[PDB]
From Swiss-Prot, chain A:
The chain holds residues 18 to 195 of 361 of the full protein. A major RuBisCO chaperone. Acts after GroEL-GroES chaperonin to fold and/or assemble the large subunit of RuBisCO (ccbL, rbcL). Cooperates with RbcX in RbcL folding, plays the major role in assembly of dimers into RbcL(8)-Raf1(8) intermediate complexes. RbcS replaces Raf1, leading to holoenzyme formation. This is RuBisCO accumulation factor 1. Homodimer. Forms an RbcL(8)-Raf1(8) complex. Each Raf1 dimer clamps the exterior of an RbcL dimer, protecting it. This insertion probably contributes to the assembly of RbcL(8). Forms complexes of many stoichiometries with RbcL with and without RbcS. RbcX and Raf1 can bind simultaneously to RbcL. It comes from Nostoc sp. (strain PCC 7120 / SAG 25.82 / UTEX 2576). Belongs to the RAF family. Has 3 domains, the N-terminal alpha-helical domain, an extended flexible linker and the C-terminal beta-sheet domain. The 2 C-terminal beta-sheet domains are swapped and pack against each other to form the dimer interface. Residues 1-178 are annotated as: N-terminal alpha-helix. The lineage of its organism: Bacteria, Bacillati, Cyanobacteriota, Cyanophyceae, Nostocales. It is found in: Cytoplasm. Disulfide bonds: none annotated. It comes from the Bacteria.
Swiss-Prot record, chains B, D:
PROSITE patterns: RUBISCO_LARGE. RuBisCO folding and assembly commences when the nascent large subunit folds with the help of chaperonin GroEL-GroES. Both RbcX and Raf1 help folded RbcL release from the chaperonin and dimerize; dimeric Raf1 binds to RbcL(2) leading to an RbcL8-Raf1(8) complex. RbcS displaces Raf1, resulting in holoenzyme formation. The basic functional RuBisCO is composed of a large chain homodimer in a 'head-to-tail' conformation. In form I RuBisCO this homodimer is arranged in a barrel-like tetramer with the small subunits forming a tetrameric 'cap' on each end of the 'barrel'. RuBisCO catalyzes two reactions: the carboxylation of D-ribulose 1,5-bisphosphate, the primary event in carbon dioxide fixation, as well as the oxidative fragmentation of the pentose substrate in the photorespiration process. Both reactions occur simultaneously and in competition at the same active site. The active site is at 252 (proton acceptor). It comes from Nostoc sp. (strain PCC 7120 / SAG 25.82 / UTEX 2576). The lineage of its organism: Bacteria, Bacillati, Cyanobacteriota, Cyanophyceae, Nostocales. Keywords: Bacterial microcompartment, Calvin cycle, Carbon dioxide fixation, Carboxysome, Disulfide bond, Lyase, Magnesium, Metal-binding, Monooxygenase, Oxidoreductase, Photorespiration, Photosynthesis. The disulfide bond which can form in the large chain dimeric partners within the hexadecamer appears to be associated with oxidative stress and protein turnover. The gene is cbbL. It is an enzyme of class 4 (lyase). This is Ribulose bisphosphate carboxylase large chain. It catalyses: 2 (2R)-3-phosphoglycerate + 2 H(+) = D-ribulose 1,5-bisphosphate + CO2 + H2O; D-ribulose 1,5-bisphosphate + O2 = 2-phosphoglycolate + (2R)-3-phosphoglycerate + 2 H(+).
UniProtKB/Swiss-Prot annotation, chain C:
An RbcL-specific chaperone. The central cleft of the RbcX homodimer (RbcX2) binds the C-terminus of an RbcL monomer, stabilizing the C-terminus and probably preventing its reassociation with chaperonin GroEL-ES. At the same time the peripheral region of RbcX2 binds a second RbcL monomer, bridging the RbcL homodimers in the correct orientation. The RbcX2(2)-bound RbcL dimers then assemble into the RbcL8 core (RbcL8-(RbcX2)8). RbcS binding triggers the release of RbcX2. When rbcL-rbcX-rbcS or rbcL-rbcS were overexpressed in E.coli no change in reconstituted RuBisCO activity was observed, which suggests RbcX plays no role in RuBisCO assembly in this system. However in PubMed:8472962 E.coli chaperones groL and groS were also overexpressed, which may compensate for lack of rbcX. Belongs to the RbcX family. Its main location: other. Signal peptide: none annotated. It is found in: Carboxysome; Cytoplasm. This is RuBisCO chaperone RbcX. One of its GO terms (molecular function) is protein folding chaperone. It comes from Nostoc sp. (strain PCC 7120 / SAG 25.82 / UTEX 2576).
């Protein structure tokens, strides 16, 4: 009797991971996605963001995140957690905490998930940085700020460089720019 | 020597070029760059404002030339590519010369209309969402019978490539029907909508206007041709046949680098073009804003300022077993190239769910191909055909 | 090209030169500290390639013996790796003499 | 209240408005401005970033609202004037509301094509250079006989103004011939080329397409109509009849100030429009760059970035004796309104040479009119008719 997962959607019953998981039930019982929108108000383009989000949020509380991150990402903050899809199971919950505090938008957490991707693509840690994503986006913001030889152009990358840098050794590398 | 003023900041609205220059023996680095910015154009003159060198390579230096805004015609790629590098490749005082980059302003990008269809607009008639595409290259009836059985394995389209025009054994009209009659017998029998990409190349353009009005009468999907042996002038009479019809989007030491050729081709038009630096222009066709990465060939900074993206085509060859290596690098928004066609769709669809679990698809790619053999006999054959060649010589 | 080759060759033989590093330490510790050789032999079997990125995993659990492996990259990589130039091309000429002979072995079989 | 973020600098590419607001009693200055920036539009929202007051006037404050770039359609004045002030004039929480200014970016100005003809392009068929122009307003034959003798005194054109359409006493066709037959008899007999500006106003536009194809067949000069009782939509079907023909350029407490209406009308089109603040927009129609003059109504800064200028029309009335007062203020590049017509050309042509000697034409203006009476009998009559009214009561 899978029709009671048809009912909990046009009544607005639950929160967004509760719909993010009830879709993948119905996507394992022979459903064409095209006809899912006929009885429930979500086209599978819009369902696509909460499939992958609940495929992240089951990994967010798994990998040891804090309480307030697991409180607000139960209710709001949807498409940011769609953008952490290109990571692994081990570093998403480290970034779910970090992209909550700064209240970043869709496109900014797009590139933070890109910056932690290349910082973890490396076989080697670069100088003065650790495993935290606050060091990841402050490594790129310093690696791409060495190339300016001008003072009043690099502080666009130093204010953001002093916005994320997590350990104190990663704070000194930003301080050499000044 | 008023063509070299390094005491100058290039404005917010200037057009702005680079050049990886290599001069003859004894030729200084400061007069070869004034030999470029002056002989391009003729307050109406370009000025080489910077002279940065290149470390550990054959005597190159990076010349930053800044042309004004008004020097050029609004909405033209032929003008920009010709008033800049007209007779500048023709000097003997240089050993080589390449054109690595161009910054268009925000003010000049939005004169152009761009690609007709984007990362959003492509999914309307194309029934594929959130997963990349597939398509393989192919008398007259027997030619129609072969595409009749390639699309029946998972190929999202096929390719009438390798230059099949109307020869005396296989005319142009009797090839269109038999690969239109071969779509109507695979649309319903496979549950999806597929095209067969067909050449429109003719001697004239009046004949080319008949090889594209016959194709889509209301008959037929989105059907393309090239840019070589053709121009940004030849493919403007038919890329703007997509301004009525939505029908042609695939474009199939001493030079001009491809990322200049890719700025010229988004702004001209088309929805997915064929091709750190491999990652470089594929973050120009797809992104909105790109900050300056000198180790990627991206020497400038220009936001694209709300204009439709364009995807990429796989350009390495046959790839049947080397499937998860492409899925990470080109991402979601790209396009890739009947038992031999059913092995292609299965290896593509499998990896995408093992990415979304959180499994590191870079360090695990082959085992995802191996677990997909236990329900697919066409991947049982292919993995043995490809290469396991290694070295453990430590 | 060749710079694609030569930079790939630079890391392969390096990882081979960091193996003779680990083997020189291996015979050394079979004489000084036989408990330390029996534990180094336990970690050695783990099938981990990339000798440069193999010593980094040694610093994770044992930051000290990974310096003695590194020590001979200045000391034994000078009596092994600078003798490579005069000792490749001699073997190339030998393979030009070992293998040209069997073109004659088929020819005498065809004789 | 996310529609008021004063912690924000408006970007290089934002669209940027002002408003001279006046609220009801007790209504704060910070919520009336969020009552404007939010109910205009609906990252897609305008934000009032500044709240500056007005000194010594009835409780006004200047609201600086910043809409994004992408919010609007490229090349449209109807959209910009409607998505901004659609239902914002319809509140009861304000006593008044005016729209004093708009900054268009550099990126959005050069989407538009602008006036077809400028300060340069007007002098091609118009045979007048470096000196302003002259033109006076006018059965069917007897109507043709009167313009037959106004242009014969120096009038560079004439005006079929005050709304003469086809009435049952004077039809539309029998007015065009008799003021075309009246140009062919004054072009050669006076040594210059003159037009007679004629109305094209019809009920339909299909009839208006016949009142403008008959006028210039190849028959006739540059011939205009209005903007009121018409739109930026009505006069787009015929201002782009100047994109083939070069033929229609003259445009003849609680509101919208004229300098908003003048940005809307250069960018739409036309070569000389009818109208510190009188000096204000006439340094917007004619200039390239204008820096912020808060005591002139020019509250913003935007370079026009190479787009054709547009001149001004004299708007005070009959001016026969008050000639050198207009020549300084509107300058060279403007337009002004048979014995009674020969007094007009003489008083204009005389002052311009006494400016170029170096004589201060402001503090000397009447004596230049008086010395031009001693070779012209038509200026002997006019100076006595006009006003010498003074007060020496010190």
């Amino acid at each position: 009797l899978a029709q009671e997962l048809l009912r909990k959607l046009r009544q607005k019953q639950g929160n967004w991971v509760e719909w993010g998981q009830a879709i993948a039930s119905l996507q394992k019982s022979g459903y064409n996605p095209q006809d899912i929108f006929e009885a429930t108000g979500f086209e599978p383009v819009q369902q696509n963001q909460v499939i992958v989000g609940s495929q992240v949020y089951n990994s967010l509380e798994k990998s040891g995140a804090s309480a307030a991150t697991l409180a607000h990402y139960a209710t709001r903050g949807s498409d940011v957690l769609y953008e952490l899809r290109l990571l692994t199971h081990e570093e998403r919950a480290a970034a779910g905490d970090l992209t909550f505090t700064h209240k970043v938008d869709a496109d900014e957490a797009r590139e933070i998930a890109k910056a932690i991707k290349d910082f973890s693509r490396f076989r080697i840690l670069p100088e003065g940085f650790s495993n935290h994503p606050g060091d990841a986006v402050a490594y790129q913001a310093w690696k791409l700020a060495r190339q300016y030889s001008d003072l009043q152009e690099r502080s666009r990358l130093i204010a953001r460089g002093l916005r994320f840098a997590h350990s104190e050794t990663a704070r000194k590398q930003i301080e050499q720019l000044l | 020597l008023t063509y070299y003023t390094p005491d100058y900041t290039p404005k917010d609205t200037d057009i702005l070029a680079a050049f990886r220059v290599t001069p003859q023996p004894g030729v200084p680095f400061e007069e070869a760059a004034a030999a470029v910015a002056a002989e391009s154009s003729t307050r109406y003159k370009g000025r080489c404002y910077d002279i940065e060198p290149v470390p550990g390579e054959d005597n190159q230096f990076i010349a930053y030339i800044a042309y004004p805004l008004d020097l050029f015609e609004e909405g033209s790629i032929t003008n920009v590519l010709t008033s800049i590098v007209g007779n500048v490749f023709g000097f003997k005082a240089l050993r080589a010369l390449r054109l690595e980059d161009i910054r268009f302003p925000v003010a000049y990008i939005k004169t152009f209309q761009g690609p007709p269809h984007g990362i959003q607009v492509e999914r309307d008639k194309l029934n594929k969402y959130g997963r990349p595409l597939l398509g393989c290259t192919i008398s007259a009836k027997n030619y129609g019978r072969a595409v009749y059985e390639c699309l029946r394995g998972g190929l999202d389209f096929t390719k009438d490539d390798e230059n099949i025009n109307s020869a005396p054994f296989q005319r142009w009209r009797d090839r269109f029907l038999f690969v239109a009659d071969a779509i109507t017998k695979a649309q319903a029998e496979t549950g999806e909508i597929k095209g067969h990409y067909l050449n429109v190349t003719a001697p004239t353009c009046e004949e080319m206007l008949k090889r594209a009005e016959y194709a889509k009468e209301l008959k037929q999907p989105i059907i393309m041709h090239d840019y070589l042996t053709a121009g940004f002038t030849a493919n403007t009479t038919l890329a703007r046949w997509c301004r009525d019809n939505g029908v042609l989007l695939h474009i199939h030491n001493h030079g001009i680098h491809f990322r200049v050729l890719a700025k010229a081709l988004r702004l001209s038009g088309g929805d997915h073009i064929h091709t750190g630096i491999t990652m470089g222009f594929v973050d120009l066709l797809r992104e909105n804003y790109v900050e300056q990465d000198k180790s990627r060939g991206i020497y400038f900074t220009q936001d694209w300022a709300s204009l439709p993206g364009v995807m990429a085509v796989a350009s390495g060859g046959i790839h049947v077993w080397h499937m998860p290596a492409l899925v990470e690098i080109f991402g979601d928004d790209s396009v890739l190239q009947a038992p031999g066609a059913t092995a292609n769709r299965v290896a593509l669809e499998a990896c995408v769910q093992a990415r979304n679990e959180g499994r590191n698809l870079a360090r695990e790619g082959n085992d995802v191909i191996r677990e997909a053999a236990k329900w697919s006999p066409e991947l049982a054959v292919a993995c043995e055909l490809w290469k396991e060649i290694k070295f453990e010589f430590e | 090209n060749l710079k694609q080759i030569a930079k790939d060759t630079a890391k392969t033989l390096q990882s081979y030169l960091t193996y003779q590093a680990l083997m020189t330490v291996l015979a050394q510790l079979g004489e000084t500290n036989p408990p330390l050789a029996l534990w180094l032999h336990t970690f050695s079997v783990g099938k981990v390639q990339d000798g440069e990125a193999y010593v980094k995993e040694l610093f994770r659990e044992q930051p000290d013996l990974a310096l003695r492996i590194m020590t001979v990259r200045e000391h034994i990589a000078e009596e092994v790796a600078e003798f490579l130039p005069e000792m490749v091309r001699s073997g190339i000429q030998q393979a030009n003499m070992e293998q040209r002979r069997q073109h004659l072995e088929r020819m005498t079989h065809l004789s």
